[PDB]
Amino acid sequence: RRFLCGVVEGFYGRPWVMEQRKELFRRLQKWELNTYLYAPKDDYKHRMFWREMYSVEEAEQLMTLISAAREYEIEFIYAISPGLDITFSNPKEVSTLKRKLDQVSQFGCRSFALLFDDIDHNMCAADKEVFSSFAHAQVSITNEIYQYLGEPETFLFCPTEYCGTFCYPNVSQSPYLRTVGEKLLPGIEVLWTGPKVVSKEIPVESIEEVSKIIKRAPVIWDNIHANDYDQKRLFLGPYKGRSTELIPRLKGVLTNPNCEFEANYVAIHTLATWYKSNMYSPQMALKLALTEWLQEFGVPHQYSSREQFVPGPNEKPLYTAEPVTLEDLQLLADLFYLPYEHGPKGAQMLREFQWLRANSSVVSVNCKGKDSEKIEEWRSRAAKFEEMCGLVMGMFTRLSNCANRTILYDMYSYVWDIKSIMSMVKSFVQWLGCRSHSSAQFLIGDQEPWAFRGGLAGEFQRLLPIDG
Amino acid sequence: RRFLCGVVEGFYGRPWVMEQRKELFRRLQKWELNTYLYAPKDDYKHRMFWREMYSVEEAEQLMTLISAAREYEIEFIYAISPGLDITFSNPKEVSTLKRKLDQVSQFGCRSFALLFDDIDHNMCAADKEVFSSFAHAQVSITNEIYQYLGEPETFLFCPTEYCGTFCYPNVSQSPYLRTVGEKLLPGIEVLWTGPKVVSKEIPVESIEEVSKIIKRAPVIWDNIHANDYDQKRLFLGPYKGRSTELIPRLKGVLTNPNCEFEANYVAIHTLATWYKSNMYSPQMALKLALTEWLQEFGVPHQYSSREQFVPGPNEKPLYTAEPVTLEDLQLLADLFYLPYEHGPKGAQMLREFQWLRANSSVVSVNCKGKDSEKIEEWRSRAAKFEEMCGLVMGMFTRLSNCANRTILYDMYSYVWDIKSIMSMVKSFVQWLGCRSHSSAQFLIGDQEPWAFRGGLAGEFQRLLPIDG
Secondary structure, three states, X not given: OOOXXXXXXXXXXXXXXXXXXXXXXXXHHHOOOOEEEEOOOOOHHHHHOOOOOOOHHHHHHHHHHHHHHHHOOOEEEEEEOHHHOOOOOOHHHHHHHHHHHHHHHHOOOOEEEEEOOOOOOOOOHHHHOOOOOHHHHHHHHHHHHHHHOOXXXXXXXXXXXXXXXXXXXXXXXXXXXXXXXXXXXXXXXXXXXXXXXXXXXXXXXXXXXXXXXXXXXXXXXXXXXXOOOOOOOOOOOOOOOEOHHHHHHOOEEEEOOOOOHHHOHHHHHHHHHHHHHOOOOHHHHHHHHHHHHHHHHOOEOOOOOOOOOOOOOOOOOOOOOOOOOHHXXXXXXXXXXXXXXXXXXXXXXXXHHHHHHHOHHHHOOOXXXXXXXXXXXXXXHHHHHHHHHHHHHHHHHHHHOEOOOHHHHOOHHHHHHHHHHHHHHHHHHHHHHOOOOOOOOOOEOOEOHHHHOOHHHHHHHOOOOOOO | OOOEEEEEEOOOOOOOOHHHHHHHHHHHHXXXXXXXXXXXXXXXXXXXXXXXXXXXXXXXXXXXXXHHHHHOOOEEEEEEOHHHOOOOOOHHHHHHHHHHHHHHHHOOOOEEEEEOOOOOOOOOHHHHOOOOOHHHHHHHHHHHHHHHOOOOOOEEEEOOOOOHHHXXXXXXXXXXXXXXXXXXXXXXXXXXXXXXXXXXXXOHHHHHHHHHHHOOOOEEEEOXXXXXXXXXXXXXXXXXXXXXXXXXXXXXXXXXXXXXXXXXXXXXXXXXXXXXXXXXOHHHHHHHHHHHHHHHHOOEOOOXXXXXXXXOOOOOOOOOOOOOOHHHHHHHHHHOOOOOOOOHHHHHHHHHHHHHHHOHHHOOOOOOOOOHHHHHHHHHHHHHHHHHHHHHHHHHHHHOOEXXXXXXXXXXXXXXXXXXXXXXXXXXXXXHHOOOOOOOOOOEOOEOHHHHOOHHHXXXXXXXXXXX
16 A cells, blocks of 8 residues: 655745755655645746746756655655636647656656645636536546546645635535535545644544545645745744554645755654654654754864864863754754744743733832742742743754854754843843832833833734733 | 055855955055955965965965956955964964964065954963963064064964954053053054944044044944845945044054955945045945946846847737836835945834834724825825835835846845835735725735744744833
């Protein structure tokens, strides 16, 4: 039995380059994965201008990538998304799609996919006179393409209603999915993403409900680590929340990685472990992933003596950089954990800070003669919070000195922002702790840099509704 | 009389590459600027490991860069910041610095600078037994280095107190500045940044006060567009707040650009205009800068129809991209304008949104039976806000289609975040406007996604007290 496991390059943003993709292939082979799907959202010749043909230089790029994929025995799937403006009743459109796919095949590509995600539900007047339904036209054109291509072993189709939230009135009773299942040829595999676009968890019953319609096992398009619906968020947590009992009931798992190329080591490693387990413990998987990931940070750059000055007792020490530790990586993971939850350490820090803020007025000003136990407890908790903030700042400082700065420079902004905000919060906590003998306003320097926050974004965020 | 005017690469983060620097040189020659200072913070052979010698490949890159600068007649100044760990009473340190500067000189470099910014104020026991003061040691080593190099025409020195807020107890009475001014050789220029590290405006009298101490006209290191103290901020607004009367009283103006290479175009252009006026109106300077900048966006990519399909009356229209226009760039500028103020249009949008939020109760619940004038006013203002949000979204959509995508790709994240938050605000405003007849929760999809806006950094930011 064959099974699909791999990655889908289908995020919005600056697309990855050839070197990154080759390194990705090497990692995929190391981790015993087998599938790469190429459907970048911002490739003009993929979605927006699919009708155009590739040039000689683009042809060389594609041929090099496909040959590299063949070297590492990783299946390469090329996708097309003509749903933006294709007319189904015009033979010229079908011929153009056939010619495009033939140009792709000429390079040596083997597997092809057609996507109709994120388009409208309407058709032109011409198609109304031919097809009874939108699904009818989609299925007819997909079947024609599949027959033309020679019935390859692998072929992927994404229904417009790729999630339950987009099915009306429900998954079981949707006429679109019923028509698809009735009229789609048996040789095509169907993509699905779960109850929601970003599914927090996937119960088996929903997958069975989908199977009862599509008459085949689906292929999971998991956006558990996608970050193109709010690009301020980075996700480094392990693959979590999907039950392994789905493995016999699925044709394959394909993961959407983070837009930043070097931030997807942990997610892909955890996915590989998750699949390999049952041909599972999210905490153990994360621990193993970080243990393996630490090896690629190397050592911090150090002065190389490979006649050198050596200081004495009265001379300033030479600058030295500490190595990056496992604890730093764990803390970094907890700071950027999951789309629907934080890590244990980040959540605990947030709760502790909220508690400290809540009871600041208990002992802040002129608290002599009050309960000493409250004063000591508040001071101790504040000190522990200070230690946590110092740990975060030290993590950033140590990561800054890594010799292999490629890892950091692809995620520099997020870590720098989180360490800056931790520093600001530490200053705020100190000012709260000094109220009884200092009446000065909370200030960093002589002013309030936090008032500006993130400019317009932050000022608009400040006005959004909250639970409290 | 020679005058220094140009750019300093002295921000933290991922450093610029050779291609970007060459393009910068071409632009500088076009805009009639004459100075480039090279002191990237995160260059390991610049600051943290200054004692090491450049390798052959690095030497070739430096020679190519210097020759390119020679082609464009742009003065190139190379800086070193040995103050991190250098010992002043040990001749080995001085010899190493001399050898390093001589290696730099053999590449063809002509101008050199020594920086002692962002260091400690303490001294080792070895130096305290020799020099009377910290400033004494700094000035002595700088003077010896200056005399060894052959007294170049241009030489820059950055004191440790580079801003008024770092002067103790004040500017005029600072012993450090007095000692530096007395003991520094007359042939060296002195960097200064104004009252604060990020000075909002520069009163004329402050410069005269500083000159009364340093006994020489300073060279301005302006961080008006620096964004490495909170890297969520992007600054695209014009050069503002610096009176032209400073020009006769200054020896040069050097700007710190944004970390993103392509985001500084407007800034640099404005600076040139500000200089070229008095060898000034911020509004006109910005208009000219954006008019010149628009030419680099070219035209959006379009279908190439050089047997070509042409749709009929009842066929779905082809995907067509609209060009990027002046209004889109002005709106973008106002969205990311200045450290201490927003653009007029963004500030007005924020004020209008705040007013609408404040007066939600006028029509939120059971609006029928209430005063008509208030209802009409609130609805009209809401409609105008909706139109402005739509303008923002159209700006993002049109910017996404540029053929020369690089201009967008270096600042993709900021525009993407602002357009996402504008969309969320539009949805929230609609929900507020439809409450009288729709009692459903103000949800997006089935949830409130802004509960995870900004992740842990956003959550920590949200709890910082402000006056407004």
